[PDB]
Amino acid sequence: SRRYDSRTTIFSPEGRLYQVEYAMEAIGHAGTCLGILANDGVLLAAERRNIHKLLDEVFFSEKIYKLNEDMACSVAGITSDANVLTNELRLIAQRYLLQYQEPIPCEQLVTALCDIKQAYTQFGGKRPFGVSLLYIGWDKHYGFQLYQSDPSGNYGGWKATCIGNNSAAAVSMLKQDYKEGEMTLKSALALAIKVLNKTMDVSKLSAEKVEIATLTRENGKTVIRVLKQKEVEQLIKKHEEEEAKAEREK
Amino acid sequence: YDRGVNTFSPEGRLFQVEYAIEAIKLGSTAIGIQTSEGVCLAVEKRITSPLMEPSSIEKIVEIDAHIGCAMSGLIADAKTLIDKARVETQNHWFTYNETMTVESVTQAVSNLALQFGEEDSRPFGVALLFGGVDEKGPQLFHMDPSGTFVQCDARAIGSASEGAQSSLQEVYHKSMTLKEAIKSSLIILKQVMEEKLNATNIELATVQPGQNFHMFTKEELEEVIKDI
Amino acid sequence: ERGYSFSLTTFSPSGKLVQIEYALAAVAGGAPSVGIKAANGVVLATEKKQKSILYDERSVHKVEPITKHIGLVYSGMGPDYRVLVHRARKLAQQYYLVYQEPIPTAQLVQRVASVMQEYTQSGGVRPFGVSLLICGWNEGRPYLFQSDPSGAYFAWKATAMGKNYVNGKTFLEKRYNEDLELEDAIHTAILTLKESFEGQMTEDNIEVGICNEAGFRRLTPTEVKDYLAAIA
Amino acid sequence: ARPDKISGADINSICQESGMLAVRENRYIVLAKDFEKAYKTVIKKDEQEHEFYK
Amino acid sequence: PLPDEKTKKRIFQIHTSRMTLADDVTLDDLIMAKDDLSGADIKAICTEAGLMALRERRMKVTNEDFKKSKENVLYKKQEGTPEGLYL
Amino acid sequence: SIMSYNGGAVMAMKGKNCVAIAADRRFGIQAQMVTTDFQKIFPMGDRLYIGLAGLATDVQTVAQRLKFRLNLYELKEGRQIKPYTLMSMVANLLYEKRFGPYYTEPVIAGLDPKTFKPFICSLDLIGCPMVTDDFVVSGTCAEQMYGMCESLWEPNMDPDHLFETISQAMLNAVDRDAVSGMGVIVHIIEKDKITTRTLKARMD
Amino acid sequence: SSAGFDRHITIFSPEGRLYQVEYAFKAINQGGLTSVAVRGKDCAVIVTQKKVPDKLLDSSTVTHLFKITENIGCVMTGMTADSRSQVQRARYEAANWKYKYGYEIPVDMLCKRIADISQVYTQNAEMRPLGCCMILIGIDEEQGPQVYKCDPAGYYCGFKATAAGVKQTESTSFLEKKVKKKFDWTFEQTVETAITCLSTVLSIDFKPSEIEVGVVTVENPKFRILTEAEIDAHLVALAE
Amino acid sequence: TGYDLSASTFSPDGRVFQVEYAMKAVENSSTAIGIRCKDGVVFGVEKLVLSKLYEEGSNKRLFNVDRHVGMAVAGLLADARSLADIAREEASNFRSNFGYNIPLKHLADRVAMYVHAYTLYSAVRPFGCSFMLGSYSVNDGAQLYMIDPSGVSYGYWGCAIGKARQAAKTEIEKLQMKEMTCRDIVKEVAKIIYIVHDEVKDKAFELELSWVGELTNGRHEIVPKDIREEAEKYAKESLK
Amino acid sequence: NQYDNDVTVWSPQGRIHQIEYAMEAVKQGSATVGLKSKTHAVLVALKRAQSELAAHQKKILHVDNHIGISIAGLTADARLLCNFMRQECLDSRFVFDRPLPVSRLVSLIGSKTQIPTQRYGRRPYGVGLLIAGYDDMGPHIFQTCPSANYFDCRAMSIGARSQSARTYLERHMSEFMECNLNELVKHGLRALRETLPAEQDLTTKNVSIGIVGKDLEFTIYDDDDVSPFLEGLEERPQ
Amino acid sequence: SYDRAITVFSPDGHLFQVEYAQEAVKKGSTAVGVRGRDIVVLGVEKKSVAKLQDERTVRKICALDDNVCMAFAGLTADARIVINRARVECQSHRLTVEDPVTVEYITRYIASLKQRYTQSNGRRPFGISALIVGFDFDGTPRLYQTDPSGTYHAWKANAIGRGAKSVREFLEKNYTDEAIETDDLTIKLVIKALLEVVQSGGKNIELAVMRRDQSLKILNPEEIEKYVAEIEKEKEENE
């Protein structure tokens, strides 16, 4: 009865949590997401996993989940586990809107999630969550924000971020392409399409394979703008023009 | 081979209780002595570094007014038994309007010395020394993780237990007085400690019918050590 | 029963869910099936070979309706199929009690996917060995969805599960196309089920259901025998 | 048809065993019971609680 | 234990005491740029440093190429950056 | 009466292609007003509203619960809600507390977001739905508004005659009741634009 | 194949199997019983046998013919304890069908119920999968008699003439050789095939005190176990 | 290895080893037999006295479940007393609820489903007890049922449970159930209970006899072993 | 030895090992001897101590106005079945307003200690009860076991090397019936003096004697009311 | 639910998960802290910051009440629940007895909670050590540390985390009673003690104080550079 137990909770005799490392190794597969340093805007990036010619494209969002008027998130890893986490998280945000008649700030939304993932890591004999997802949004106090999730439940706020294993090179590219407060959303989108060009291995950045969701603060709309391919393609040709121009130095 | 947490030995007894007994051996030492006048008691704080403040460490907490205590081994396991044993003494006093006798306290703890399991986790890793004066006189007691509770006239515990008992039957008789026993403990302590005996290492605790209370203050111990 | 309740599905050293991979192999050991969406409704085709001439085909049905406009077939094992069939049966009716409205298939696959993903993690079960195809005609555009033992959900134009799904997949890569009619989906569906069948296909072998936009109608062996006559 | 279901295979020379049960006869022209009995012994199959999905 | 800024600087400067690349090597910006990783690969990036410059047959540094060639090893350690928060 | 604790009323009159919902906002305790800026009409999505009347606690609380489940429903599916679905939502939300009831009588008025088909309905406190074609009323005063809207309602109404019809019916209806008053707000919504006007009412 | 504990509890192998159910498919074979069901035109016949290894054991208790309701009979194979424990759940769910839905249960739905409970025995990992094999008969409105079989894998299942147990791998091969022809099915044709299909298997041609025949027939639709005398009438009626 | 430990795991040859180990745990216990006559049920248990051990009448393996039903347990003893308390409680439920005395068939089902119910989980172990059930009612007749640790309950005219099991049920076919009165059947039991278990294994022994039927008028009780003392009067004269 | 794990697992020989290991926990306790006459019941125990200065751990504990039990083995479980013992005494003393006979008390000990010998994760009780009391039909001396098999004896003994006590008792069981208390007790603790090595006493500070009678409520004597019983015994032979 | 004893006694007497799970304390960020006679000073080091990204969300010195400061080591994820539970506990103490929370009470709360969090069924023990510093009512400053065993233990100064033997060995050369006769000697004493700590480039040194009546003041990187200036100039005076 106990000799069939798999012991998902215990420390392992070298120093570290044995299970959370193998949790993070699954986030290291199948995911690519990032966000950019942006004033008067904030953007998300998405990589199509299934780019086959046989899908329907009728969902109108493949990796972006709209969970309030003002916020969104980006699934990485095992997708339907995040389809538990967005039901839970959306219900947390909406019950805070019930209890206070006021929109939920993003920080306590993040901790209100990470106490649950942490609650499965602490006790249970239970398979942990395997989703490390991002956060964008507006709030009354701090303007614009970005956040980061872990299966351990430790969260950090970024200004440019890393999902997943292929995005560590995107972190080197973002520190090598660093700035302080320039958006000018064509600069941020040109940098983002640049990062998805040079990081993702498929050449020339086909217009189907990428996806960009932006958020512009408008009073009192706070538009979560998910843009279509017709304004992706001329952005791609803009970046290819910039590569053809910048290569002329040599 | 992690087997049943509640499984008997081939000898055999409880595996995890037998493993729990060995956890007393690495804890700090203590000395109890029953006197006809009262109960004296001794322990060592085991200062780890001059970083630490020495007087915040508790090895004696006093359960009621009239029932002393001494803990050992893992202290954080002991604190739970302390705080609940106090509740059992108060519940005795508020059903009964009389002082709970020193004996029934250790039944009221040792009846839950063994509650581990899965339904209905681990046994406790402490070896307590209870003192006190009820109407039956000054009693000195001793309980283990197994719950096997017995009276002991002059009990040692811990790492020093073998040499302290072994050296301690030589220097004990039936008509010991108090101030004889108090300086009769610190000889054994300064034999068994590794740091130099001074005002910060040990603490005494006495409880009497006519010397009470008479708890535990500093600068008494300065006079106590300098009588060596 | 005991409160053992530990998840026997854990992570690998590589990071792969092992029981979900093995459950997908148990999907690959199942019967073939294909389903095609085409421009007015969605046609689901399955492939049911009785192991003997003693058997009765009138008893067990594979195309199983969920509402009067929603069908549902599988590719996997039947005893794990019927449980979440009944779970979808009860599950649509709370939506019909609360909102008083015919439930969208998009909402069905969200909720059934929540049941299945939530079931991959709970106390001491294996996951289901079933990969579903869920069709239906809601709000004017007929839908076709596929779930899986990982709890995921896809939105295919015209897919196939079971045996030889790379064969029927490449066959439905070219021969399936932009837009057809309802009868024209049946031809290529019976053809791609005729990719990996035995030497004869009768009214007892295949069993084909459709969704009109006016409502569901599971087809009879009269027309199932008439269309495959006319080899595909 | 029927012996093809139980074939192992157990392919080439069990067909010769089907002929080596004709020498078991006792009959001039091999009876139907001779063939069927040859293939049914090897190899056995145990069904069906699982593969019934077909 | 894993080396610190004092050990890594004493690792590379002593390893290069016999042979440097184009001399001129300063260890202040080497340990400051990449944070962090063992002194193993610091010789590897310097192995390819004079190796890529060997296309010029002895000595030269291309600012656009050097930081691009450094990107390969920089991302190599920046793919597995988190653990954690190993802590 | 128990409904007469705060007073108040909601009228919604279907026109030709536009729908007008009006209510009062006086807020008080059985004889004594407190404020005038109280709100009994709530936005639910775009080009749709709900009126609420009765005991003010169930107005605010039922409004917040309906806004709760409504935001969860438009965040489950991308479409806006159809008004029949809203009616059965309010009917279930009232019927969950069957035995200890909420003391309110909601009025759902809004255009279908698919077309420009107007729609009005009103619900009992137990949760009985009712679809009409002319008008629904809900409040302490009801016989007054049935006295007006059965003599000023025409079938095919341009927004001018709809606005003036609901204006005369609300003013002359409320000025005969005692416990209500203190202003009349009129939401006239059409396919193009939502329009809110507050009339010039008696302050007594 | 094997990986981990898949040879012990009901979790998946790497090849897609699960071994506990395919051990349960030969948990029947300890019983030592051939049981054949034949659906006629207006009737259906169960045939079984018994083994009486002692003269002190009874003939009145070892009958596997268990009656579920007054229109539904059944017979059991596999091990005895799982078989009888299946029976009270069959009777109990039939009675709850009578209390809840008010009309007599069809023989179709009871096998879906038993198959789903046997699935819940299979699905959860810490409960034994009940290695018995369930066989039903019964009468329905305008559908004639019916025969169904429920294996301990959780599927309801029912055909024209079916038999599972020990010797039945060849008995199904005889019933394929006997069913597909131009012969109709009268009553004594079905009974006279129900014996001879089993007598081809065992090759004994024995006394009428061994086979138990339960039958149902739409003249009087109640399930009925034959008396030994008319069993002897059939058994010498087949001997030309 | 690994297939014998838990109870809920099938073995690859297709049987359950914890049940099979439970069957031969009763095999080490002493012989206790039973038999019915045309109007009563006679029990007999041989009991073991080595030197001193217990006062006469300790831990009697003959129990008394209802007014008209008794046990005759053999195997491990504590779980047999647990089954005595549970069968006691079940007779209390039927007696309280339906107003008339419990038939032996329902009692055999409701006990045997519990003995089966502890062979499906690794929460518990399978029982290690087997017991007789004798009874008599004028509208019922004498029935004698036999429950094994596996959960199989069926009906004997006569049975035997113990070490000397086969040798103690060899001779029962010499006796005749149909004609004999149970007053003969008392000494007709005690002759072979004295004959079986020869005294080289254990030096001494002691006999219990319990007897329910028409002569006791439905009530089950122990016969007064001193009264008529028919056992050893025949048994010392039965050696030659 | 992988089937020595838990109480659930049967052996391939048919002997559940956890019960055998708990019997080993019974044998490790000290000796105690209970023996009855027709008119009285006497149970005598032998204490042991941890050291010289620690007092001897007692065995015989008072339970009811006529029921008394000895003990060997574990102590905390003896307090557990002790508290259950008191509670089932004063339950029927509270309800029926009569004292309980012993022979229906011990079935609650068997059905009490049964369930922790079957279900998973439950140890048996290391226990050594020698129950003694009056019902209306005289005295009774029972014993228990962790396998919950209770024996109505005329005399038993359990504990360390208690078999020598038995082989004393069998050659006097024909004479342990008629005699009254004063020689019955010393007939008791002669078995205790055979449970010891023959070179140390047999002191006064260790032996405890409990008696239950008709005109004599259940009483425990401790070294000093024992001192009138230990006077006048025979010397141990050479 | 979840009935399994995770943490059991080893045969050599140790608990594993208690006396093993302090390795997660050993492989986290370091944090030191001294107490002045008037103003306390604690600070985290080895921050390992990305140095181009945000910093207020990685802030790991926080408050329960304004009376009480936090500092901890180990993995921060398990520390978050201990902090929030400690806050919910120390608010109901304000709902009771009207004095503010004494620091010894809240350390008995984290210590008792963490003990019964080791003791119970199916629960991995916490892998954090933590410090709890606060100048109480009646103006007296003191400090305590925690333990995954749950043994609160009053120090005069701190070393927890990576190389606690290094800094804890270093502060014996600190404890001259001149330090701290001035508060600027206390703060520059902490930073000069963190010189022997990890890299100490003026970036990963985050210090915070509490002036015995004030709310805790997170100091900007303004006077940390000036304390490195007078510390390095003092080392210029050291020869």
Numbering used by the authors:
A (entry chain I): 2 to 251
B (entry chain K): 8 to 127, 134 to 241
C (entry chain H): 3 to 234
D (entry chain D): 365 to 418
E (entry chain B): 354 to 440
F (entry chain P): 2 to 205
G (entry chain G), H (entry chain M): 5 to 244
I (entry chain L): 4 to 241
What does the paper say about this structure?
Three of these correspond to the previously reported SA, SB, and SC states of RP–CP subcomplex, which were refined to nominal resolutions of 3.6, 7.0, and 5.8 Å, respectively. Consistent with our previous report, the SA, SB, and SC states of the ATP-γ-S-bound RP–CP subcomplex all showed a closed CP gate.
The proteasome is composed of a 28-subunit barrel-shaped core particle (CP) and two 19-subunit regulatory particles (RP)5–8 capped at both sides of the CP. The globular domains of a substrate are mechanically unfolded by a heterohexameric ring-like subcomplex in the base consisting of six distinct subunits, Rpt1−6, which belong to the ATPases-associated-with-diverse-cellular-activities (AAA) family.
